[PDB]
Amino acid sequence: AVLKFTTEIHPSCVTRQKVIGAGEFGEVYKGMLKTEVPVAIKTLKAGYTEKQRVDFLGEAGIMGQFSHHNIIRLEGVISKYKPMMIITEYMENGALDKFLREKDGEFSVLQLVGMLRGIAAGMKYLANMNYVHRDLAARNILVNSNLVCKVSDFGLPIRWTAPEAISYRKFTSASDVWSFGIVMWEVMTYGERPYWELSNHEVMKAINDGFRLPTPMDCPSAIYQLMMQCWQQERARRPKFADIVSILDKLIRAPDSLKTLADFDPRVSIRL
Ligand SMILES: Cc1ccc(NC(=O)c2cccc(C(F)(F)F)c2)cc1Nc1nc(-c2cccnc2)nc2c1cnn2C
């Protein structure tokens, strides 16, 4: 029943090709699926514990339940044979943080805001399904060849985490909203490191002292206003994901709304 939303894939349809990561007790590979389609494949290798099996098949089962344009698509699961596997779609463009950093300045404001609308729609879906992500960050978002962003989770983030989650482990959709605000800043800066060189303790002290990240360059005023309200100390005052999706949708559909830019604070004076 755990796998009720998932298709069981036969091992003969899967070809693992290269290791692209390490799972909790296994490797992640790039490979091919016949039914050929490129896929990502996470294995659970011999010797896994009971807890690891529960977490692995539980992950597969929740992923099978998710069917949304902005959530990574599960192709299927191998549970009847060993090694067990979770198989997803593969995105040639890869993870959003590296993608942005390698394409600095190459997109329009409308394209960047469109990416954020898609991420927000995915998060609205997860929150509605009562799934708390806990690690929302550009590094966990994949980009397809239509620039569509798919929320994912590759495993292990002070800089992205809401204060109540840091302080007492209160992870909710509202702490995900804080993270989403950080993702907004990541997108609009083309993948800059949140808080630059500040250490983790310096970031937490700054947040507690009331400081917040400054505006990206060339950032629409409405977009910075929105990310700032994602960073309200009081969890109950932050927008819900429904509010975020609605605002982003309305801004894109009336795109002149994005022409008004927030003032950028220069960190350097050049006089000529
Ligand atoms: C195979 C697999 C198994 C499990 C998961 N699980 C989730 O994403 C997950 C879990 C819980 C909740 C949610 C959410 F709530 F967000 F929906 C999502 C993803 C993939 N797939 C990957 N794919 C790629 C990849 C790389 C380059 C281009 N394309 C793809 N790298 C990966 C992984 C996994 N690791 N790595 C390094």
mmCIF file of C-alpha atoms and ligand atoms in Angstrom:
data_model
loop_
_atom_site.group_PDB
_atom_site.id
_atom_site.type_symbol
_atom_site.label_atom_id
_atom_site.label_comp_id
_atom_site.label_asym_id
_atom_site.label_seq_id
_atom_site.Cartn_x
_atom_site.Cartn_y
_atom_site.Cartn_z
ATOM 1 C CA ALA A 1 0.000 0.000 0.000
ATOM 2 C CA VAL A 2 2.940 2.309 0.722
ATOM 3 C CA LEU A 3 3.653 2.225 -3.032
ATOM 4 C CA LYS A 4 0.012 2.693 -4.048
ATOM 5 C CA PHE A 5 0.728 5.671 -6.335
ATOM 6 C CA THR A 6 3.862 4.146 -7.876
ATOM 7 C CA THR A 7 4.545 1.837 -10.796
ATOM 8 C CA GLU A 8 6.822 -1.133 -10.210
ATOM 9 C CA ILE A 9 9.588 -1.223 -12.832
ATOM 10 C CA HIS A 10 11.303 -4.442 -13.806
ATOM 11 C CA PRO A 11 15.112 -4.420 -13.394
ATOM 12 C CA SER A 12 15.675 -5.487 -17.004
ATOM 13 C CA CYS A 13 14.359 -2.074 -18.094
ATOM 14 C CA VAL A 14 17.013 -0.132 -16.143
ATOM 15 C CA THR A 15 20.630 0.477 -17.167
ATOM 16 C CA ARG A 16 22.837 2.279 -14.648
ATOM 17 C CA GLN A 17 25.647 4.188 -16.352
ATOM 18 C CA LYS A 18 27.468 6.626 -14.047
ATOM 19 C CA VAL A 19 27.461 7.474 -10.349
ATOM 20 C CA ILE A 20 26.183 11.022 -9.804
ATOM 21 C CA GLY A 21 25.808 10.956 -6.021
ATOM 22 C CA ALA A 22 25.512 8.929 -2.849
ATOM 23 C CA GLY A 23 22.218 7.929 -1.277
ATOM 24 C CA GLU A 24 21.555 7.309 2.387
ATOM 25 C CA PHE A 25 22.631 3.687 1.840
ATOM 26 C CA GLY A 26 23.408 3.336 -1.835
ATOM 27 C CA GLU A 27 24.463 5.367 -4.826
ATOM 28 C CA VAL A 28 22.608 7.672 -7.185
ATOM 29 C CA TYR A 29 23.251 7.028 -10.864
ATOM 30 C CA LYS A 30 22.424 8.484 -14.229
ATOM 31 C CA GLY A 31 21.058 5.803 -16.522
ATOM 32 C CA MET A 32 18.457 4.799 -19.073
ATOM 33 C CA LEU A 33 14.921 3.423 -18.791
ATOM 34 C CA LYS A 34 13.242 1.328 -21.486
ATOM 35 C CA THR A 35 9.454 1.504 -21.781
ATOM 36 C CA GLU A 36 15.042 4.824 -23.984
ATOM 37 C CA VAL A 37 14.573 7.747 -21.590
ATOM 38 C CA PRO A 38 17.406 9.165 -19.449
ATOM 39 C CA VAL A 39 16.715 8.733 -15.749
ATOM 40 C CA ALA A 40 18.197 9.267 -12.307
ATOM 41 C CA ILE A 41 18.359 6.123 -10.168
ATOM 42 C CA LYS A 42 18.829 5.918 -6.395
ATOM 43 C CA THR A 43 19.680 2.490 -4.994
ATOM 44 C CA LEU A 44 19.326 0.890 -1.559
ATOM 45 C CA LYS A 45 22.264 -1.504 -1.356
ATOM 46 C CA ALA A 46 22.655 -4.754 0.555
ATOM 47 C CA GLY A 47 22.887 -4.270 4.306
ATOM 48 C CA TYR A 48 20.391 -1.422 4.676
ATOM 49 C CA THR A 49 18.640 -1.270 8.029
ATOM 50 C CA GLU A 50 14.930 -1.541 8.759
ATOM 51 C CA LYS A 51 14.733 2.220 9.298
ATOM 52 C CA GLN A 52 16.540 2.829 6.007
ATOM 53 C CA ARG A 53 14.074 0.553 4.214
ATOM 54 C CA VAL A 54 11.077 2.325 5.766
ATOM 55 C CA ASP A 55 12.475 5.738 4.822
ATOM 56 C CA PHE A 56 13.395 4.595 1.298
ATOM 57 C CA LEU A 57 10.055 3.007 0.410
ATOM 58 C CA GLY A 58 8.258 5.822 2.218
ATOM 59 C CA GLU A 59 10.096 8.334 0.038
ATOM 60 C CA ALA A 60 9.157 6.341 -3.063
ATOM 61 C CA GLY A 61 5.535 6.240 -1.950
ATOM 62 C CA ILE A 62 5.162 9.947 -1.264
ATOM 63 C CA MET A 63 6.900 10.758 -4.557
ATOM 64 C CA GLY A 64 4.433 8.526 -6.384
ATOM 65 C CA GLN A 65 1.593 10.501 -4.838
ATOM 66 C CA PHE A 66 2.931 13.773 -6.264
ATOM 67 C CA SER A 67 1.686 14.603 -9.782
ATOM 68 C CA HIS A 68 2.450 18.262 -10.516
ATOM 69 C CA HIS A 69 4.187 20.229 -13.262
ATOM 70 C CA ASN A 70 6.669 21.684 -10.757
ATOM 71 C CA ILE A 71 7.490 18.531 -8.766
ATOM 72 C CA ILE A 72 10.071 15.985 -9.884
ATOM 73 C CA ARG A 73 8.336 13.082 -11.619
ATOM 74 C CA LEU A 74 8.779 9.548 -10.329
ATOM 75 C CA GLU A 75 9.052 7.048 -13.166
ATOM 76 C CA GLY A 76 8.788 4.056 -10.863
ATOM 77 C CA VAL A 77 10.313 1.896 -8.171
ATOM 78 C CA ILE A 78 12.105 -1.429 -7.927
ATOM 79 C CA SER A 79 10.975 -2.979 -4.641
ATOM 80 C CA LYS A 80 10.568 -6.674 -5.546
ATOM 81 C CA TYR A 81 14.260 -7.170 -6.393
ATOM 82 C CA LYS A 82 17.602 -6.148 -4.894
ATOM 83 C CA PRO A 83 19.072 -3.597 -5.018
ATOM 84 C CA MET A 84 15.863 -1.621 -4.555
ATOM 85 C CA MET A 85 15.655 1.551 -6.606
ATOM 86 C CA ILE A 86 13.810 4.851 -6.947
ATOM 87 C CA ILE A 87 13.788 6.075 -10.562
ATOM 88 C CA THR A 88 12.955 9.630 -11.612
ATOM 89 C CA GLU A 89 13.077 11.754 -14.730
ATOM 90 C CA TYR A 90 16.442 13.309 -15.618
ATOM 91 C CA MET A 91 16.997 16.994 -16.452
ATOM 92 C CA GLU A 92 19.871 17.734 -18.815
ATOM 93 C CA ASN A 93 20.112 21.295 -17.446
ATOM 94 C CA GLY A 94 20.598 19.978 -13.921
ATOM 95 C CA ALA A 95 20.266 21.777 -10.618
ATOM 96 C CA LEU A 96 19.099 25.386 -10.552
ATOM 97 C CA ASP A 97 21.902 26.830 -8.413
ATOM 98 C CA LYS A 98 24.672 25.640 -10.752
ATOM 99 C CA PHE A 99 22.517 26.440 -13.803
ATOM 100 C CA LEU A 100 22.053 30.083 -12.756
ATOM 101 C CA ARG A 101 25.718 30.558 -11.838
ATOM 102 C CA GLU A 102 26.807 29.280 -15.273
ATOM 103 C CA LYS A 103 24.321 31.533 -17.122
ATOM 104 C CA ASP A 104 24.801 34.827 -15.280
ATOM 105 C CA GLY A 105 22.739 37.610 -16.830
ATOM 106 C CA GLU A 106 21.360 35.438 -19.647
ATOM 107 C CA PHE A 107 17.623 35.650 -18.835
ATOM 108 C CA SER A 108 14.933 38.300 -18.747
ATOM 109 C CA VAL A 109 13.209 39.411 -15.563
ATOM 110 C CA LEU A 110 10.039 37.750 -16.866
ATOM 111 C CA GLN A 111 11.902 34.461 -17.310
ATOM 112 C CA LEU A 112 13.356 34.629 -13.798
ATOM 113 C CA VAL A 113 10.006 35.509 -12.223
ATOM 114 C CA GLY A 114 8.399 32.703 -14.223
ATOM 115 C CA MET A 115 10.822 30.233 -12.662
ATOM 116 C CA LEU A 116 9.788 31.508 -9.227
ATOM 117 C CA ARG A 117 6.088 31.140 -10.022
ATOM 118 C CA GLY A 118 6.698 27.505 -10.917
ATOM 119 C CA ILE A 119 8.675 26.780 -7.763
ATOM 120 C CA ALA A 120 5.959 28.469 -5.701
ATOM 121 C CA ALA A 121 3.239 26.421 -7.421
ATOM 122 C CA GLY A 122 5.153 23.244 -6.620
ATOM 123 C CA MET A 123 5.539 24.294 -2.993
ATOM 124 C CA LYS A 124 1.863 25.245 -2.740
ATOM 125 C CA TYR A 125 1.057 21.705 -3.898
ATOM 126 C CA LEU A 126 3.417 20.082 -1.389
ATOM 127 C CA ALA A 127 2.127 22.210 1.494
ATOM 128 C CA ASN A 128 -1.469 21.428 0.514
ATOM 129 C CA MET A 129 -0.579 17.712 0.437
ATOM 130 C CA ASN A 130 0.780 18.219 3.991
ATOM 131 C CA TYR A 131 4.391 17.581 2.969
ATOM 132 C CA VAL A 132 6.979 19.815 4.651
ATOM 133 C CA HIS A 133 10.087 20.013 2.480
ATOM 134 C CA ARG A 134 12.622 21.194 5.110
ATOM 135 C CA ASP A 135 15.461 21.737 2.595
ATOM 136 C CA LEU A 136 14.113 24.069 -0.081
ATOM 137 C CA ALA A 137 17.081 25.676 -1.855
ATOM 138 C CA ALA A 138 18.131 26.182 -5.460
ATOM 139 C CA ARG A 139 20.442 23.168 -5.171
ATOM 140 C CA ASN A 140 17.307 21.000 -4.762
ATOM 141 C CA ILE A 141 15.449 22.322 -7.849
ATOM 142 C CA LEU A 142 15.919 20.837 -11.317
ATOM 143 C CA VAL A 143 15.481 22.774 -14.568
ATOM 144 C CA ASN A 144 14.098 21.186 -17.737
ATOM 145 C CA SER A 145 14.594 22.247 -21.359
ATOM 146 C CA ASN A 146 11.490 24.478 -21.202
ATOM 147 C CA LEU A 147 12.954 26.352 -18.183
ATOM 148 C CA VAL A 148 10.387 24.603 -15.954
ATOM 149 C CA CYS A 149 11.609 24.222 -12.376
ATOM 150 C CA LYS A 150 10.874 20.942 -10.576
ATOM 151 C CA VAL A 151 11.134 20.903 -6.786
ATOM 152 C CA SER A 152 13.202 17.899 -5.704
ATOM 153 C CA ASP A 153 15.195 16.764 -2.672
ATOM 154 C CA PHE A 154 18.650 15.237 -3.032
ATOM 155 C CA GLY A 155 19.370 15.153 0.701
ATOM 156 C CA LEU A 156 21.899 17.164 2.635
ATOM 157 C CA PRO A 157 21.353 24.494 5.668
ATOM 158 C CA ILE A 158 21.326 27.296 8.253
ATOM 159 C CA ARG A 159 21.289 30.016 5.603
ATOM 160 C CA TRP A 160 18.043 28.743 4.065
ATOM 161 C CA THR A 161 16.217 27.807 7.278
ATOM 162 C CA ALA A 162 13.638 29.775 9.233
ATOM 163 C CA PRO A 163 14.561 30.826 12.789
ATOM 164 C CA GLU A 164 11.995 28.588 14.508
ATOM 165 C CA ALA A 165 13.278 25.540 12.608
ATOM 166 C CA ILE A 166 16.868 26.357 13.589
ATOM 167 C CA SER A 167 16.027 27.205 17.184
ATOM 168 C CA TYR A 168 13.607 24.411 18.082
ATOM 169 C CA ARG A 169 13.117 22.154 15.039
ATOM 170 C CA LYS A 170 9.682 23.555 14.153
ATOM 171 C CA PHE A 171 9.550 22.696 10.453
ATOM 172 C CA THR A 172 6.267 23.617 8.761
ATOM 173 C CA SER A 173 5.044 25.009 5.454
ATOM 174 C CA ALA A 174 5.757 28.423 6.988
ATOM 175 C CA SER A 175 9.446 27.616 7.479
ATOM 176 C CA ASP A 176 9.395 26.435 3.851
ATOM 177 C CA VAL A 177 8.094 29.920 2.966
ATOM 178 C CA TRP A 178 11.175 31.464 4.580
ATOM 179 C CA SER A 179 13.309 29.121 2.476
ATOM 180 C CA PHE A 180 11.319 30.102 -0.601
ATOM 181 C CA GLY A 181 12.209 33.728 0.066
ATOM 182 C CA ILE A 182 15.869 32.714 0.066
ATOM 183 C CA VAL A 183 15.292 30.873 -3.215
ATOM 184 C CA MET A 184 13.763 34.045 -4.663
ATOM 185 C CA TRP A 185 16.999 35.858 -3.798
ATOM 186 C CA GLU A 186 19.068 33.029 -5.280
ATOM 187 C CA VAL A 187 17.148 33.245 -8.568
ATOM 188 C CA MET A 188 17.240 37.033 -8.877
ATOM 189 C CA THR A 189 20.997 37.111 -8.130
ATOM 190 C CA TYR A 190 21.846 34.251 -10.547
ATOM 191 C CA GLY A 191 22.900 31.956 -7.734
ATOM 192 C CA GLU A 192 24.769 34.147 -5.296
ATOM 193 C CA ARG A 193 25.602 32.684 -1.904
ATOM 194 C CA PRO A 194 23.030 33.947 0.636
ATOM 195 C CA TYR A 195 24.772 36.305 3.089
ATOM 196 C CA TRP A 196 28.066 35.933 1.151
ATOM 197 C CA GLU A 197 30.979 35.191 3.472
ATOM 198 C CA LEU A 198 29.112 35.409 6.789
ATOM 199 C CA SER A 199 29.510 32.268 8.859
ATOM 200 C CA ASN A 200 26.477 30.295 10.012
ATOM 201 C CA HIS A 201 26.580 31.909 13.462
ATOM 202 C CA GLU A 202 26.980 35.377 11.923
ATOM 203 C CA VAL A 203 23.921 34.724 9.732
ATOM 204 C CA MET A 204 21.785 33.710 12.711
ATOM 205 C CA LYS A 205 22.979 36.689 14.764
ATOM 206 C CA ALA A 206 22.234 39.060 11.882
ATOM 207 C CA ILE A 207 18.729 37.633 11.453
ATOM 208 C CA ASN A 208 18.056 37.852 15.187
ATOM 209 C CA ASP A 209 19.344 41.458 15.192
ATOM 210 C CA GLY A 210 16.811 42.292 12.456
ATOM 211 C CA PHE A 211 19.055 42.374 9.382
ATOM 212 C CA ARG A 212 17.785 40.890 6.125
ATOM 213 C CA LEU A 213 19.358 40.269 2.742
ATOM 214 C CA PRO A 214 19.493 43.423 0.577
ATOM 215 C CA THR A 215 17.897 43.731 -2.815
ATOM 216 C CA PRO A 216 19.464 41.950 -5.783
ATOM 217 C CA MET A 217 20.581 44.147 -8.645
ATOM 218 C CA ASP A 218 17.888 44.932 -11.227
ATOM 219 C CA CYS A 219 15.191 43.402 -9.054
ATOM 220 C CA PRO A 220 11.508 44.353 -9.430
ATOM 221 C CA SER A 221 10.244 46.215 -6.379
ATOM 222 C CA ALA A 222 7.291 43.833 -6.015
ATOM 223 C CA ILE A 223 9.621 40.816 -6.034
ATOM 224 C CA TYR A 224 11.828 42.178 -3.244
ATOM 225 C CA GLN A 225 8.772 43.182 -1.225
ATOM 226 C CA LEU A 226 7.533 39.607 -1.530
ATOM 227 C CA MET A 227 10.793 37.937 -0.495
ATOM 228 C CA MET A 228 11.090 40.326 2.467
ATOM 229 C CA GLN A 229 7.679 39.249 3.792
ATOM 230 C CA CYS A 230 8.759 35.612 3.526
ATOM 231 C CA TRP A 231 11.430 36.541 6.093
ATOM 232 C CA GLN A 232 9.158 37.800 8.876
ATOM 233 C CA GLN A 233 10.421 36.568 12.236
ATOM 234 C CA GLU A 234 6.844 35.793 13.307
ATOM 235 C CA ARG A 235 5.888 32.628 11.435
ATOM 236 C CA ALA A 236 2.177 33.478 11.423
ATOM 237 C CA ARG A 237 2.783 36.762 9.576
ATOM 238 C CA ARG A 238 4.476 35.223 6.529
ATOM 239 C CA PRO A 239 2.511 34.732 3.299
ATOM 240 C CA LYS A 240 1.050 31.314 2.676
ATOM 241 C CA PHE A 241 2.127 29.602 -0.539
ATOM 242 C CA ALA A 242 -1.305 30.412 -1.999
ATOM 243 C CA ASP A 243 -0.552 34.119 -1.508
ATOM 244 C CA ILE A 244 2.872 33.757 -3.157
ATOM 245 C CA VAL A 245 1.550 31.914 -6.218
ATOM 246 C CA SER A 246 -1.268 34.425 -6.630
ATOM 247 C CA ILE A 247 1.067 37.431 -6.440
ATOM 248 C CA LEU A 248 3.635 35.938 -8.808
ATOM 249 C CA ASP A 249 0.918 34.950 -11.285
ATOM 250 C CA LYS A 250 -0.604 38.436 -11.250
ATOM 251 C CA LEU A 251 2.769 40.131 -11.711
ATOM 252 C CA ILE A 252 3.604 37.950 -14.728
ATOM 253 C CA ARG A 253 0.172 38.465 -16.299
ATOM 254 C CA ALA A 254 0.527 42.261 -15.914
ATOM 255 C CA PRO A 255 4.249 42.351 -16.740
ATOM 256 C CA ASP A 256 4.556 46.144 -16.664
ATOM 257 C CA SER A 257 4.268 45.626 -12.896
ATOM 258 C CA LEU A 258 7.830 44.250 -12.953
ATOM 259 C CA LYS A 259 9.359 47.340 -14.593
ATOM 260 C CA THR A 260 9.516 49.233 -11.284
ATOM 261 C CA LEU A 261 12.842 48.314 -9.697
ATOM 262 C CA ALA A 262 13.909 48.349 -6.071
ATOM 263 C CA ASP A 263 16.845 50.629 -5.307
ATOM 264 C CA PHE A 264 20.138 48.729 -5.207
ATOM 265 C CA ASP A 265 22.479 49.779 -2.394
ATOM 266 C CA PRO A 266 25.987 50.115 -3.882
ATOM 267 C CA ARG A 267 28.721 48.428 -1.882
ATOM 268 C CA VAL A 268 31.263 50.422 -3.935
ATOM 269 C CA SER A 269 31.487 54.028 -5.075
ATOM 270 C CA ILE A 270 32.881 54.748 -8.536
ATOM 271 C CA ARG A 271 33.079 58.461 -9.332
ATOM 272 C CA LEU A 272 33.716 59.727 -12.860
HETATM 273 C C1 LIG B 1 16.577 9.263 -8.329
HETATM 274 C C2 LIG B 1 15.874 10.079 -7.277
HETATM 275 C C3 LIG B 1 15.441 9.495 -6.089
HETATM 276 C C4 LIG B 1 14.851 10.238 -5.085
HETATM 277 C C5 LIG B 1 14.651 11.598 -5.259
HETATM 278 N N1 LIG B 1 13.822 12.272 -4.332
HETATM 279 C C6 LIG B 1 13.352 13.540 -4.413
HETATM 280 O O1 LIG B 1 13.684 14.328 -5.293
HETATM 281 C C7 LIG B 1 12.325 13.920 -3.393
HETATM 282 C C8 LIG B 1 12.201 13.288 -2.157
HETATM 283 C C9 LIG B 1 11.259 13.726 -1.242
HETATM 284 C C10 LIG B 1 10.436 14.796 -1.553
HETATM 285 C C11 LIG B 1 10.539 15.431 -2.787
HETATM 286 C C12 LIG B 1 9.668 16.598 -3.132
HETATM 287 F F1 LIG B 1 8.846 16.942 -2.137
HETATM 288 F F2 LIG B 1 10.381 17.690 -3.418
HETATM 289 F F3 LIG B 1 8.900 16.366 -4.198
HETATM 290 C C13 LIG B 1 11.482 14.983 -3.703
HETATM 291 C C14 LIG B 1 15.121 12.210 -6.415
HETATM 292 C C15 LIG B 1 15.715 11.459 -7.426
HETATM 293 N N2 LIG B 1 16.443 11.967 -8.428
HETATM 294 C C16 LIG B 1 17.585 12.644 -8.612
HETATM 295 N N3 LIG B 1 17.842 13.244 -9.784
HETATM 296 C C17 LIG B 1 19.053 13.818 -9.944
HETATM 297 C C18 LIG B 1 19.308 14.508 -11.234
HETATM 298 C C19 LIG B 1 20.545 15.090 -11.506
HETATM 299 C C20 LIG B 1 20.748 15.772 -12.693
HETATM 300 C C21 LIG B 1 19.702 15.852 -13.588
HETATM 301 N N4 LIG B 1 18.503 15.299 -13.367
HETATM 302 C C22 LIG B 1 18.326 14.645 -12.211
HETATM 303 N N5 LIG B 1 20.041 13.840 -9.033
HETATM 304 C C23 LIG B 1 19.741 13.249 -7.876
HETATM 305 C C24 LIG B 1 18.536 12.639 -7.563
HETATM 306 C C25 LIG B 1 18.718 12.133 -6.254
HETATM 307 N N6 LIG B 1 19.925 12.401 -5.810
HETATM 308 N N7 LIG B 1 20.556 13.091 -6.803
HETATM 309 C C26 LIG B 1 21.914 13.574 -6.632
#
